Amino acid sequence: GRLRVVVLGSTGSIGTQALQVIADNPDRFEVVGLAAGGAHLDTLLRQRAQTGVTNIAVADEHAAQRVGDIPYHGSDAATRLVEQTEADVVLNALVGALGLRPTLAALKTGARLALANKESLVAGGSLVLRAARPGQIVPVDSEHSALAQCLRGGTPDEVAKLVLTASGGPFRGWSAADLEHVTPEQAGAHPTWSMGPMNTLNSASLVNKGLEVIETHLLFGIPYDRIDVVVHPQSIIHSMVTFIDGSTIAQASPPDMKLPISLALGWPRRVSGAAAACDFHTASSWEFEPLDTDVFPAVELARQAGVAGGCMTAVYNAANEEAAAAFLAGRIGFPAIVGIIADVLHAADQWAVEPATVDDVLDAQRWARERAQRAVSGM
Amino acid sequence: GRLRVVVLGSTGSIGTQALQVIADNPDRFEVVGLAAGGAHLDTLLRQRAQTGVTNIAVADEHAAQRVGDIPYHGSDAATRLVEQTEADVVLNALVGALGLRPTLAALKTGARLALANKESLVAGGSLVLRAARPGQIVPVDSEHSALAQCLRGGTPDEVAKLVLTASGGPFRGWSAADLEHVTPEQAGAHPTWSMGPMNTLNSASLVNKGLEVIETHLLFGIPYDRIDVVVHPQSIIHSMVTFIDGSTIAQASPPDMKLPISLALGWPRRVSGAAAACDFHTASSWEFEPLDTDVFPAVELARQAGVAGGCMTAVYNAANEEAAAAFLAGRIGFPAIVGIIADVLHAADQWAVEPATVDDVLDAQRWARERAQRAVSGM
Ligand SMILES: NC(=O)C1=CN([C@@H]2O[C@H](COP(=O)(O)OP(=O)(O)OC[C@H]3O[C@@H](n4cnc5c(N)ncnc54)[C@H](OP(=O)(O)O)[C@@H]3O)[C@@H](O)[C@H]2O)C=CC1
Ligand SMILES: NC(=O)C1=CN([C@@H]2O[C@H](COP(=O)(O)OP(=O)(O)OC[C@H]3O[C@@H](n4cnc5c(N)ncnc54)[C@H](OP(=O)(O)O)[C@@H]3O)[C@@H](O)[C@H]2O)C=CC1
Ligand SMILES: CC(=O)N(O)CC[C@@H](c1ccc(Cl)c(Cl)c1)P(=O)(O)O
Ligand SMILES: CC(=O)N(O)CC[C@@H](c1ccc(Cl)c(Cl)c1)P(=O)(O)O
Numbered sequence A, B: 001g002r003l004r005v006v007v008l009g010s011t012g013s014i015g016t017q018a019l020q021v022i023a024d025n026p027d028r029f030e031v032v033g034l035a036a037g038g039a040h041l042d043t044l045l046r047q048r049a050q051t052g053v054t055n056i057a058v059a060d061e062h063a064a065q066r067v068g069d070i071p072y073h074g075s076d077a078a079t080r081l082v083e084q085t086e087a088d089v090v091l092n093a094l095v096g097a098l099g100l101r102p103t104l105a106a107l108k109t110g111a112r113l114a115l116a117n118k119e120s121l122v123a124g125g126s127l128v129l130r131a132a133r134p135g136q137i138v139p140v141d142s143e144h145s146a147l148a149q150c151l152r153g154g155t156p157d158e159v160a161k162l163v164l165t166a167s168g169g170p171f172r173g174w175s176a177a178d179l180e181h182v183t184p185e186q187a188g189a190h191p192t193w194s195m196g197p198m199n200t201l202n203s204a205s206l207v208n209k210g211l212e213v214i215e216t217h218l219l220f221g222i223p224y225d226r227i228d229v230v231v232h233p234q235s236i237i238h239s240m241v242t243f244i245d246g247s248t249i250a251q252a253s254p255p256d257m258k259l260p261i262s263l264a265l266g267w268p269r270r271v272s273g274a275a276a277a278c279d280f281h282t283a284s285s286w287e288f289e290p291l292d293t294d295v296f297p298a299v300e301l302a303r304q305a306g307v308a309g310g311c312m313t314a315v316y317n318a319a320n321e322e323a324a325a326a327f328l329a330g331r332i333g334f335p336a337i338v339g340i341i342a343d344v345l346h347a348a349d350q351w352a353v354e355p356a357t358v359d360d361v362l363d364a365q366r367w368a369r370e371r372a373q374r375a376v377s378g379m
């Protein structure tokens, strides 16, 4: 019975929650592979001693060294683990477009792919899709896990709009003016639950949502002018679908990535007690309000990148990563993140071409990153 | 494919909206028979003129006398028309227990039953289930249509509970006291041109939700203690399905029965443009609050009555019918409606038996009214 799972980026936020669900359901899953950057050795050590898995991948050469006994090391350590470890599912919980190679390697083994690393799909684009077979990529991201469950009840020609909900980030309601005084402390702190750093910042910049709009077009095949976004502070409703008759179906639950993770891992069977359900034993209200595009153009920028397509989406992400890094380092301002992105994108003309090989994509991201530094150093 | 529809109760609210839907979607539907009571004979004859259907039935002979060329007339006219008409869908929009025979005749023809009539299920419980085959009955009630669509979110064995939403009525969140000086007009007991003061009252009394809770059990097989009710003022979400993993699927839409009516008619294919969808260009809110059962025991009784099965639900509804009348005639106070219902059910233990024939159900009701009328006059 048990499904054989490989966890990439097991030491991270998604990763550890994934091993909890696997630990709490030994009847459904078995851990057969682990991979990490190398920055959280003690975590990785305790993960090995607990799951009893030694088939491990560590990116950092020096780190893999002082730990000893690690079969795969170096930047390709994660991709090699995938190619040589038989599994049923590969949970890609790595962060960044760097996870693009493990994703392709995973699809190529034929195993299912629990995707969390959205950047590999955004950057991969059509390249990754050709690699995947119908329904091989199961979403872990909560908006997509939701859309999936909501679409279970219908056919595409009956779908009118896909409505993605966004928390609005912690600066929701502010003006372009106020935004300029934002500091790395305010865009990486969260009052009620936690995620990784990069994903936390993108949440504040609304670029994460932009990233999810593209992930949606790619995963579900719905055109960009039929994928909506709406701010929902509570983040209880995780996404909705509107059908041609006027009916809307939506997925809801108290925030907890454990939910979409256990579903992705157990696809197509739900996992009992994976998470807590909405409690109507006590009053509450679910609010909705439109996103302010003038103050947060991030999502419009994503759509534009998407419509143009090709490696244009990889540029979008490559640019963001460089500016977000420049931002947290204290080299540029917050409004500058989206700003630097429109700049890089306005010049990405030669990249509207679909990628023929990973290389075409590495080339586009390469270009984007530099053009992004040039724009940063331009300030 | 063009489905052939038989509309029972064509001059009513559900029936005229069904005809609007059919009129605006000829490519999908076609009317091949209409049935009314005779209270609005002129409207029925005009419908004959408009649609071109001569295959009509009127219950009232007196009324039928005023026309002379009606194929089916007299008690059982509607049942005869069903048995005599070839069709793909019979829409039962009849009111009261007299809608029970037509529902049964319909199921026997094997046609799809878009069931609106509440007594068919609430009164003829086991008689209707044993008679219908799986998936033959598609609900027209907004709450049930919602649950039908949300259940596509998982298998029957993954459903942890069904959550029906109620508007709460006019005395929503009121205190047990407040309900003392409650008068008829307050409970919206107005003489509207179309539907009687009962709905508005059952809705203000939560007895409607109770009946809906009973119909839910019989339609989806979910044990009563796993059927919750929650107050939702806006009435946008119509019901939700919570699964064993914590995910909850909800169905939202602006209030318009044409939506659930167009579902039942062409299930499972959605009808383009049936109703208007939820627009999120506008900042709205969906509020939820629990129901104080100690102030509205209405729903708790429905569950007790339905757990007892047999004709006990018929008792529940008949007992309410009279009690409601007593309140509408000042004979009793508001809190007294559910209280009297409480009494009548506590003494109907004999009606726990499964009804064998339609007469078994009518008797239970004839009985419950008597007993309820007694508790009013205090005899
Ligand atoms: N956290 C959340 O709530 C959500 C996350 N996601 C997505 O899931 C993905 C991961 O999110 P998250 O867990 O929060 O990010 P984290 O920062 O918490 O973890 C990132 C993981 O990747 C590993 N890693 C970093 N670099 C490399 C490398 N070069 N080679 C191999 N492994 C590496 C890290 O190992 P190390 O121990 O050395 O750091 C770490 O385990 C992201 O793409 C994100 O967008 C999506 C929706 C929700
Ligand atoms: N209205 C709503 O929003 C909802 C209604 N429902 C249920 O759907 C059912 C019908 O609702 P609704 O349309 O509003 O009720 P209506 O009073 O508006 O219409 C009842 C219809 O049945 C006809 N009728 C009455 N008696 C007979 C008879 N003996 N033989 C043949 N036809 C007869 C009437 O004709 P005539 O008037 O000429 O006598 C009329 O066309 C009910 O059981 C109700 O509870 C469920 C959910 C929502
Ligand atoms: C959990 C998840 O899926 N995310 O994308 C984290 C970021 C998003 C977010 C932030 C906070 C919460 Cl509680 C939730 Cl459910 C989602 P956002 O809507 O701000 O972009
Ligand atoms: C012809 C005209 O102007 N009318 O207002 C007809 C209204 C008629 C009417 C009244 C109420 C209903 Cl619900 C229906 Cl279907 C039809 P009536 O039964 O009163 O004749």
Ligand SMILES: [Mn+2]
Binding pocket: A141, A142, A143, A212
């Ligand atoms: Mn997300």
Ligand SMILES: [Mn+2]
Binding pocket: B141, B142, B143, B212
């Ligand atoms: Mn209803």
